[PDB]
Design a protein around this ligand. Structure first.
Ligand SMILES: [Zn+2]
Ligand SMILES: [Zn+2]
Lengths: 136, 456, 86
DNA sequence: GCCTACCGGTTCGCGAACCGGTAGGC
DNA sequence: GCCTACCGGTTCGCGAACCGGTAGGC
């Protein structure tokens, strides 16, 4: 219960650490970037552009912090974070959707285009290499 | 098709067609995982769109007058593609992700028991109820004739699913089929998810459904038609459509005693759930079934054998004779592959009448079936081609009617002995089966009507 | 998939199933998902976060029962969690 | 040959109106 | 499923204003 309650307590530290890291990053882009920027951000990173404002920065924020998601193994579609895992949203067939799901998806590093006169301010928010943490 | 009465304009203006292609389509889309199982009917009467969850009050519709007739084509062919994913004309159709898929719509002078026979085999509402248990859409399947090429595909998808089930294929592969099937044949699961076709027998179940559904539309095909001239009677009109000479064998008859013996004698020791009671005996003579059976009257080893089937099937069994499963259809359920099956015991065959404590009457057949040189089998074995010189297959059971009490009948061997042990017991059959792989080999002799007596 | 749903108003347009006033944009609001009578789909019944807990609903453990809980802001998650118990 | 009060017409500036595509509601 | 408030991108409409041509006055 000493090492149990410590890793238990020290993870809920790192979970909040993550939660409001992305949140800081989200409404940073909302302050600086228009939707079209963010749209063309994802496209550059070979990422499916979702429909929705919130969801667009939610995937740009994820993109920046963890990585540009590589296509799916079988259906070659776009994995998307959803609550507790990365779910594939592609199409294994015209009739049936793909059901791939993982906590450790494949990804290359997120490449911001040269055009960023405040990417030195956003990335100056003490952000190092780290993987997605999940709930217990 | 005709106008959807949800428009409220059905008997007012006609549904329109440009030369050939009829401006009306019925779409459907199912996702077993989401649960979604949904229709979309589009028409050009005005443009009428209907939509909702197949087989429920869930949904709505929009009737809408147009500014003009060429704007109809514009609106229609747009709505169509938006919803289906294709253009209005295409060489072969292609489904698209989350888009719909279109379904391919198309004073009587007789005895009292014979009238009851037509009464019994041409009550289509009885056949409808029959379906309700399969969960086929009850609402618009009577007026909406589902196509032949369609149903053949519905079959194929089944046969695909068995193949997939046998060699433990992907859940995806299976999922896709389950989706494909329910999309193509609208079911009614109310507010709960279409269930996956993962079993061996679930397919068999859906195969049976198609078989039965096919014969109802065949019973309609008979019923709807002829020459409506004020001369003959209604029951006679339907009798003549059966294309068969039916007669009533009298109970006093000496041959009738034999059948009742065949019935009483050859009831199964293990099938004790019910008790038979021959209400009637009919001598049945199909149109030209003797012209095609003449070949096999030369053939030796001819046997008078039982064959039971649903009361709904007998409307078509009379008009087309006994038929073999289509080639598209799955082989699941059959022991030795597609072909007419027969039993020496009235009980075993009686179970294919599918009666209950609320529907007590049932019909069972007796056919001179020219077995000839029999291919004998102990274990289940899906056969394609018969071995050489064999005209039939036999499934060897534990119990066989006494071969030293095999009475004859018009030069036909009637095995109406009671059950004794067989010559070999290394079999996985409890009772005999007789299989012919050619519709000519069978010649229907007697049609019986049986009341069942259960204990509940 | 889940019965309930929580997010920041995607627009201050949708009204609240209990009181019937416009749920303002970017505000914490909660949903209960129902069958639409109009089409073959689930639809959210949007409630003002205040109004949600007077309809008699009691989500025992929000993080496992309510959708969008992980995506919320941290301090807002705790509001739901605590208010779940009272 | 000036000046200038008066007028017809081309320009310009800025908010109102319009509008097709669509995220969000039910 | 369909309906519609919202978003950005453009056009429209109209009044100030800018300008050049001019004809009565000294
Ligand atoms: Zn995939
Ligand atoms: Zn409220």
């Amino acid at each position: 219960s000493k090492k149990e309650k410590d890793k238990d307590s020290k993870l809920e530290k790192a979970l909040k650490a993550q939660n409001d890291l992305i949140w800081n990053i989200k409404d940073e882009l909302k302050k600086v970037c228009s939707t079209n920027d963010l749209k063309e951000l994802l496209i550059f990173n070979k990422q499916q552009v979702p429909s929705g404002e919130s969801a667009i920065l939610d995937r740009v924020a994820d993109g920046m912090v963890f990585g540009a998601l590589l296509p799916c193994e079988e259906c070659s579609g776009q994995l998307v974070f959803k609550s507790d895992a990365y779910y594939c949203t592609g199409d294994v067939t015209a009739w049936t959707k793909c059901m791939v799901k993982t906590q450790t998806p494949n990804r290359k590093e997120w490449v911001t285009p040269k055009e960023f006169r405040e990417i030195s301010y956003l990335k100056k928010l003490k952000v190092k290499k780290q993987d997605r943490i999940f709930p217990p | 098709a005709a106008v959807d009465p949800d428009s409220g304009l059905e008997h007012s203006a006609h549904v329109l067609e440009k030369g050939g292609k009829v401006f009306s389509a019925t779409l459907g889309l199912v996702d077993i995982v989401k649960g979604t199982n949904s229709y979309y009917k589009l028409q050009l009467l005005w443009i009428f769109r209907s939509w909702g969850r197949v087989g429920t009050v869930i949904g709505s519709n929009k009737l809408e007058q147009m500014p003009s007739k060429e704007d109809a084509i514009e609106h229609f062919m747009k709505l169509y593609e938006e919803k289906t994913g294709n253009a209005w004309h295409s060489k072969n159709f292609t489904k698209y992700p989350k888009k719909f898929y279109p379904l391919e719509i198309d004073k009587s002078k007789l005895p009292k028991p014979v009238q009851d026979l037509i009464k019994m085999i041409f009550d289509v509402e009885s056949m409808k109820k029959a379906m309700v248990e399969y969960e086929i859409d009850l609402q618009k399947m009577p007026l909406g004739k589902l196509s032949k090429r369609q149903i053949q595909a519905a079959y194929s998808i089944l046969s695909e699913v068995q193949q997939a089930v046998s060699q433990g294929s992907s859940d995806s592969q299976i999922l896709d089929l389950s989706n494909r099937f329910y999309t193509l044949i609208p079911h009614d699961f109310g507010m709960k998810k279409p269930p996956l076709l993962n079993n061996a027998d679930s397919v068999q179940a859906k195969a049976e459904m198609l078989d039965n559904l096919l014969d109802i539309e065949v019973a309609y095909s008979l019923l709807r038609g002829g020459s409506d001239d004020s001369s003959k009677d209604p029951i006679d009109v339907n009798y003549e459509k059966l294309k068969t000479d039916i007669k009533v064998v009298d109970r006093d008859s000496e041959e009738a005693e034999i059948i009742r013996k065949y019935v009483k004698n050859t009831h199964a020791t293990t099938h004790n759930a019910y008790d038979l009671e021959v209400i009637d005996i009919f001598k049945i003579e199909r149109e030209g079934e003797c012209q095609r059976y003449k070949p096999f009257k030369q053939l030796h080893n001819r046997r008078l054998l039982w064959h039971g089937s649903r009361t709904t099937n007998f409307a078509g069994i009379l008009s087309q004779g006994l038929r073999i499963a289509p080639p598209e259809a799955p082989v699941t359920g059959y022991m030795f592959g597609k072909g007419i099956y027969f039993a020496d015991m009235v009980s075993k065959s009686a179970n294919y009448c599918h009666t209950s404590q609320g529907d007590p009457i049932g019909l069972i057949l007796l056919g001179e079936v020219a077995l000839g040189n029999m291919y004998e089998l102990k274990h289940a074995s899906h056969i394609s081609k018969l071995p050489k010189g064999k005209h039939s297959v036999k499934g060897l059971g534990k119990t066989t009617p006494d071969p030293s009490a095999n009475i004859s009948l018009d030069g036909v061997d009637v095995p109406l002995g009671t059950g004794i042990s067989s010559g070999v017991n290394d079999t996985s059959l409890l009772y005999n089966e007789y299989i012919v792989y050619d519709i000519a080999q069978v010649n229907l002799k007697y049609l019986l009507k049986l009341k069942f007596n259960f204990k509940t | 998939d889940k019965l309930y749903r929580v997010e920041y108003a995607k627009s201050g347009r949708a009204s609240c199933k209990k009181c019937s006033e416009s749920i303002p944009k970017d505000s914490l609001r909660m949903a209960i998902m129902v069958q639409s009578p109009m089409f073959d789909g689930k639809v959210p019944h949007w409630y003002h976060f205040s109004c949600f807990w007077k309809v008699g609903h009691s989500i025992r453990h929000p993080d496992v029962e309510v959708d969008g809980f992980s995506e919320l802001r941290w301090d807002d998650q705790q509001k739901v969690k605590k208010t779940a118990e009272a």
